[PDB]
Design a protein around this ligand. Structure first.
Ligand SMILES: *[C@@H]1O[C@H](CO[C@@H]2O[C@@H](C)[C@@H](O)[C@@H](O)[C@@H]2O)[C@@H](O[C@@H]2O[C@H](CO)[C@@H](O[C@@H]3O[C@H](CO[C@H]4O[C@H](CO)[C@@H](O)[C@H](O)[C@@H]4O)[C@@H](O)[C@H](O[C@H]4O[C@H](CO)[C@@H](O)[C@H](O)[C@@H]4O)[C@@H]3O)[C@H](O)[C@H]2NC(C)=O)[C@H](O)[C@H]1NC(C)=O
Ligand SMILES: *[C@@H]1O[C@H](CO[C@@H]2O[C@@H](C)[C@@H](O)[C@@H](O)[C@@H]2O)[C@@H](O[C@@H]2O[C@H](CO)[C@@H](O[C@@H]3O[C@H](CO[C@H]4O[C@H](CO)[C@@H](O)[C@H](O)[C@@H]4O)[C@@H](O)[C@H](O[C@H]4O[C@H](CO)[C@@H](O)[C@H](O)[C@@H]4O)[C@@H]3O)[C@H](O)[C@H]2NC(C)=O)[C@H](O)[C@H]1NC(C)=O
Ligand SMILES: *[C@H]1O[C@H](CO)[C@@H](O)[C@H](O)[C@@H]1O
Ligand SMILES: *[C@H]1O[C@H](CO)[C@@H](O)[C@H](O)[C@@H]1O
Ligand SMILES: *[C@H]1O[C@H](CO)[C@@H](O)[C@H](O)[C@@H]1O
Ligand SMILES: *[C@H]1O[C@H](CO)[C@@H](O)[C@H](O)[C@@H]1O
Ligand SMILES: [Ca+2]
Ligand SMILES: [Ca+2]
Ligand SMILES: [Ca+2]
Ligand SMILES: [Ca+2]
Ligand SMILES: [Ca+2]
Ligand SMILES: [Ca+2]
Ligand SMILES: [Ca+2]
Ligand SMILES: [Ca+2]
Ligand SMILES: [Ca+2]
Ligand SMILES: [Ca+2]
Ligand SMILES: [Ca+2]
Ligand SMILES: [Ca+2]
Ligand SMILES: [Ca+2]
Ligand SMILES: [Ca+2]
Ligand SMILES: [Ca+2]
Ligand SMILES: [Ca+2]
Ligand SMILES: [Ca+2]
Ligand SMILES: [Ca+2]
Lengths: 423, 429
C-alpha cells in the first residue's frame, strides 16, 4: 500500500505521487492493463493520470473542512490493473497549515467576583478554539500584566489546554469596582509557519460585601447647651460613614445599652439621620452633665455595631428666685428698746449656682430698723435709732432678696411687729 | 452657734446623736427658763430633741437611700433657739452610708447577638449594674466566667459611673458553637472610715447568652476533586451518571447549594448531559456513542445562595464502555465480470474488504461464502478477501453464477451483513 503526503491549500495540478513508478508498472503497458481508479474511492481532491500513473492535486484541499479537528487526515484512493487482476491502495495524507488564528467564543467576557474572594480562588473561563491541529492548534493564554490576577493553564492529555483566573491579592470594591484587562490566546506555529493570536476583552465586576463598619470621626463629642433648652433643640447631628453599597452602606442609629433611663427620657435620636435632639426639660439644678451612648449599625448581614459617646454639658440659667424663710419674730418690741435690739431672724436660699445663686438683700422703707448678718445666709432685723411710734402702734417690715443673675430675680416677705409696754 | 454631728443610717430609735447642751455651754437647769426650742421650719421626723437635757437622739430610722438617693453628701439641717436673749443655733447632722444594698442588674437575663465574622478586639456594651449606696459601697468592678472568647473591659467616667463591655478575644465560629452561656457578676467595694463598723462586699448576678449570628464563611465542598464513572454506550437518557453531594454547614441560603456546569465544559458534554441545579443529580440527556468518543469530561461548579458566595469546582470523568452496536460493512473493490469455462483452480473472481466500527471482538469480522459452490475464499491480508475458483464449474455456456458473502462479527448478540454479485461464464477457444 502506497503512502504520499500533500499540504492543504495546494493549487490545481500539484504533484502528489508517482504511482506507476512506485508500483513497478511500466507506462507503456498501463493502457493495455486497464490502469484505472476504483469506482468507490474517487475523490474530487485527487486526479490520477492513467497514461503516466501520476497522482496530482485537482481541487484544492482545505483540511479544516474534510477532517475538521481530527488529529489525522488521510484520503483513501484505490487503483487497479487487469489481466491479471491486481488492486493497489494509495493513502494521501493531508498536512495541516496554520491558516486560522485562535478565536474566543465571546468577544467580551464579564465575570463577577465577590470582593471577599480569597487569593488563590480560581475562576473558570471558556477556552478559545483554533481549528488547526497539532502544533498549529491552541498553545497558551496570556493576560495583561496586573497585580490582582494571574493565569493558570493546564493540560490533561488529549492535546487540550484549559485556563482559569487566579486571584492574586484581595479585591476591594470600595476602591475599584471594575477591572478591565485584555486576554489573548496564541497557537504554536513557529515553509516556515507564523504564530497567530486571538483577543478578547475581560471585565471583572467586583461584588460588594458588608466589609466596612460605620465610622464616627471621633469617639467622643462634647456639646454645651443652656438649661431649659426647648425640646427639639439640636444637640448634635451625628454622621457615621459606611462606604459599602446598598443596605451594606445604609446606617441606622440607636442608643447603646449604657444610657441612663434619665437620658433616654431627656433625649431623642432619629434612627436614620443621626439627629440627636432634646426631648425633655434640662434642669441644671438636677444635673450639670449627661452622657449619651450611641451605637450605629448598617442594615446588611453580619453588621458590626460602632459606638460613640456624646457629652452634654448643661449651662446654668437664672430660673430660680430666692427663697426667704423666717425662723423667729419677736411678738412685740419695748418702746424704749435701745439700738441693736434684735426683732427677728431669717435666712435666704437660691436654688441656682454661681452668680445666679448669690443674693443681696435689703430692707425697704425709711424705718428705724437695719439688717445685720451673723452667719452665712443668716440675717437679723435690728434697731438702728430710737422708735418713731410708741405703745400700741405696730410696724410691718418687708424685706427684698435679689439674686445676681441676668435678668436678676427677687422675692419679698413681710412681718408684723408691735410696740408694747416695758415691764 | 453651729454644730456638727454624724450618725449611721439605719440606727434604731433612741440612738444618741449629740449633746447640744454640752456642746453649746448651756446648763440644763436654765433650759426650761430660756425657752429652749426647735425652730418650726427645721423640724424633722428623724430627730427627737430632749429639751430638758439638750440631747439629740434618733427618732425615725434613717434610710439614706431614700432622703438623699445617690448624693455623695447627706446632711439633715436642724435649728434650735433660746429666748431672752434670742439666740439661734444651727446643727448639721451628717448621715453616713453603710453597705446595706447589693449591686443589681436591670434584667436577670441578657441576650447579645454577635456575628461570627466579628473581629477580635471588638467591644460590645453591656447593661451596667447599679448600686444605690455611695462611695466605696457603690459599684466597684465586673467579672465574667473565665473563658477564651470574651474578656471584660471597665471604664470609669467619674461621678460614680462605671461602664463594662465584652471584649472579643478570639474569632467566633457559629458552625462549631452557636451559643455561649456565662455568668456575669458585679461587686461593690466593701472589703477593707468615719467610725463605721466594717462593711462586707455584696455581689449581684445576671446570666449572659451570646448568640452567634451566621455569616457565609463556608464554601461548598466535594469529598473528591475528580469523580470517574463508567457507563455503557447508548445508556438511555435519564440514566444516572452520578449524584453529586456538595457540603455547606452554613445556615439558610448560606447553606443552600445550587449546582451548575462549569464554563470550561465542551458544548458536546452540555448537550449529552443534564445537571439538576438543586440536587446535583448528573444524568445523561443524549446518546453516548463510544465510537464517537470513549470518555467525556464534565466540569461542575457548586455555589451557595448567600452573599459573597464562593464557587467550588469538581470534574467528572465519564468512561464509555463499548457495545456491539455496529454491523460489519462489506465493500467489493473489483469483480471479474466474466470467467472462462476452462478456468483452472485458483482463478481469482473477486476482491473485497470488510470493516466494523466497533472495537475488539465487536469489531472482529469473520467471513463465509454461502452455498455449495465451486468457489472458495482466500485472504492475503486481514479483513481483505478474494473469491477464487476451486473445481470445475457445474454450469457452462450462458449461465452466470451468483455469489453471496456473509460477514459476521464476534459480539453478543453478533451482527452480520451480506452482499452478492453475479458473474457470467464465457466461452474460450
Ligand atoms: C456624612 O459624611 C459623609 C462623608 O464624609 C466624608 O468623609 C470625611 C473623612 C471627609 O472626607 C469629608 O470631606 C467627606 O464628606 C458626607 O458625604 C459627602 O461629603 C462630600 C465631600 O466629600 C460632600 O461634598 C460634595 O461631594 C460631591 C461628590 O459628588 C460626586 O463627584 C465626585 C467626584 O466626581 C465622586 O467621587 C463622588 O463619588 C460623587 O459621585 C461633589 O460633587 C460636591 O462638589 C460640590 O461642592 C464643591 C465645594 O466647593 C463645589 O466647588 C462644587 O462646584 C460642587 O458644588 C461636594 O464635593 C457631599 O455633600 C456629602 N454627601 C455625599 C452623598 O457625598 C455627608 O455629607 C455627611 N452627612 C451629613 C448629613 O452631614
Ligand atoms: C451529602 O452527605 C451528607 C453527609 O452527612 C455528613 O457529612 C460528613 C460530616 C460525613 O462525615 C458524613 O459521613 C456525614 O453523615 C448527607 O447528610 C445526611 O443527612 C441526614 C439528615 O440529617 C442524616 O440522617 C440522620 O441524621 C440524624 C441526625 O440529624 C438530626 O437533624 C435532622 C434535621 O434537623 C433530623 O431529621 C434528625 O432526626 C436529627 O435530629 C441521625 O440521628 C440519623 O441516624 C440514623 O442513621 C444511622 C446510620 O448508621 C443509624 O445508625 C441510626 O440508627 C439512625 O437510623 C441519620 O443519620 C444522614 O446521616 C446524613 N448522611 C448520611 C450518610 O447518613 C446528605 O444526605 C448527602 N446529600 C445528598 C444529596 O446525598
Ligand atoms: C499573535 O500576536 C501576538 C501580538 O499580539 C504575537 O506576540 C504572537 O507571536 C502572535 O503573532
Ligand atoms: C487581538 O487583538 C489585540 C489588540 O489588543 C492584539 O494585540 C492581538 O494580537 C489580537 O490581534
Ligand atoms: C460577692 O460575691 C463575689 C463572688 O461571686 C465575691 O467575690 C465578692 O467578694 C462578694 O462576696
Ligand atoms: C449572684 O449570683 C452568683 C451565682 O453564680 C454569685 O456568685 C454572686 O455572688 C451573686 O450572688
Ligand atoms: Ca485551510
Ligand atoms: Ca489549517
Ligand atoms: Ca491556528
Ligand atoms: Ca472593601
Ligand atoms: Ca464593601
Ligand atoms: Ca457596612
Ligand atoms: Ca432649672
Ligand atoms: Ca438655674
Ligand atoms: Ca437665682
Ligand atoms: Ca438603707
Ligand atoms: Ca446604704
Ligand atoms: Ca452596695
Ligand atoms: Ca464558620
Ligand atoms: Ca457560617
Ligand atoms: Ca456557604
Ligand atoms: Ca456506538
Ligand atoms: Ca460499539
Ligand atoms: Ca460489530
Amino acid at each position: 500500500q502506497l503512502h504520499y503526503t500533500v499540504q492543504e491549500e495546494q493549487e490545481h495540478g500539484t504533484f502528489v505521487g508517482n504511482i506507476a513508478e512506485d508500483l513497478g508498472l511500466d507506462i507503456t503497458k498501463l493502457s493495455a492493463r486497464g490502469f484505472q481508479t476504483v469506482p468507490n474511492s474517487r475523490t474530487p481532491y485527487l486526479d490520477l493520470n492513467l497514461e503516466t500513473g501520476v497522482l496530482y492535486v485537482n481541487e484544492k484541499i482545505d483540511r479544516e473542512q474534510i477532517c475538521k479537528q481530527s488529529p489525522s487526515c488521510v484520503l483513501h484512493l484505490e487503483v487497479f490493473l487487469e489481466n491479471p487482476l491486481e488492486l493497489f491502495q494509495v493513502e494521501i495524507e493531508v498536512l495541516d497549515i496554520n491558516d486560522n488564528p485562535p478565536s474566543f467564543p465571546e468577544p467580551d467576557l464579564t465575570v463577577e467576583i465577590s470582593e471577599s474572594a480569597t487569593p488563590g480562588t480560581r475562576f473558570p473561563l471558556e477556552s478559545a478554539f483554533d481549528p488547526d491541529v497539532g502544533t498549529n492548534s491552541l498553545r497558551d493564554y496570556e493576560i495583561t500584566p496586573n497585580s490582582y490576577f494571574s493565569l493558570d493553564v493546564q493540560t490533561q492529555g488529549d492535546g487540550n489546554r484549559f485556563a482559569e483566573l487566579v486571584l492574586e491579592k484581595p479585591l476591594d470594591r470600595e476602591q475599584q469596582a471594575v477591572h478591565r484587562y485584555v486576554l489573548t490566546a496564541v497557537d504554536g506555529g513557529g515553509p516556515p509557519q507564523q504564530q497567530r493570536t486571538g483577543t478578547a476583552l475581560l471585565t471583572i465586576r467586583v461584588l460588594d460585601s458588608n466589609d466596612n463598619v460605620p465610622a464616627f470621626d471621633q469617639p467622643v463629642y462634647t456639646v454645651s447647651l443652656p438649661e431649659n433648652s426647648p425640646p427639639g433643640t439640636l444637640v448634635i447631628q451625628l454622621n457615621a460613614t459606611d462606604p459599602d453599597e446598598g443596605q451594606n452602606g445604609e446606617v441606622v442609629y440607636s442608643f447603646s445599652s449604657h444610657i441612663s433611663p434619665r437620658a433616654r427620657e431627656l433625649f431623642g435620636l432619629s434612627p436614620r439621620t443621626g439627629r440627636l435632639e432634646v426631648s425633655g426639660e434640662l434642669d441644671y439644678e438636677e444635673s450639670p452633665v449627661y452622657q449619651v451612648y450611641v451605637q450605629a449599625k448598617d442594615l446588611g448581614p453580619n453588621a458590626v455595631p460602632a459606638h460613640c459617646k456624646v457629652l452634654v454639658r448643661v449651662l446654668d440659667a437664672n430660673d430660680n428666685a430666692p427663697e426667704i424663710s423666717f425662723s423667729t419674730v419677736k411678738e412685740a418690741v419695748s418702746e424704749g428698746a435701745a439700738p441693736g435690739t434684735v426683732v427677728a431672724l431669717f435666712s435666704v436660699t437660691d436654688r441656682d449656682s454661681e452668680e445666679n445663686g448669690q443674693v443681696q438683700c435689703e430692707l425697704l422703707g425709711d424705718v428705724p430698723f437695719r439688717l445685720k448678718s451673723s452667719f452665712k445666709n443668716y440675717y437679723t432685723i435690728v434697731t438702728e435709732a430710737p422708735l418713731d411710734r410708741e405703745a400700741g402702734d405696730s410696724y410691718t417690715l418687708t424685706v427684698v432678696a435679689r439674686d445676681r443673675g441676668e435678668p436678676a430675680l427677687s422675692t419679698s416677705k413681710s412681718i408684723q411687729v408691735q410696740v408694747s409696754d416695758h415691764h
